[PDB]
């Protein structure tokens, strides 16, 4: 069976809180409330699981979300890691 991969949101000190939130809404189809909570989870504990899915999908979403921050001049980082 294909291995599943966690998409992780990593904290940083520069990306605006609300920007992270709308990234989460747009790329991972979260509500505002859910988005804030995941954002805040990473904010407090250094990181947060966003979603767990098939590798290629996990990689694609992590990059899409990362690029949004990157092209905005933010160090916002979404990574993948196996479970
Ligand atoms: N602007 C700030 O104070 C960031 N801690 C907000 C943030 C949350 C989650 C990930 C990255 C950034």
UniProtKB/Swiss-Prot annotation:
One of its GO terms (biological process) is protein catabolic process. It comes from the Bacteria. Transmembrane segments: none annotated. Binds to the N-terminal domain of the chaperone ClpA. Involved in the modulation of the specificity of the ClpAP-mediated ATP-dependent protein degradation. Belongs to the ClpS family. This is ATP-dependent Clp protease adapter protein ClpS 2. It comes from Agrobacterium fabrum (strain C58 / ATCC 33970) (Agrobacterium tumefaciens (strain C58)).
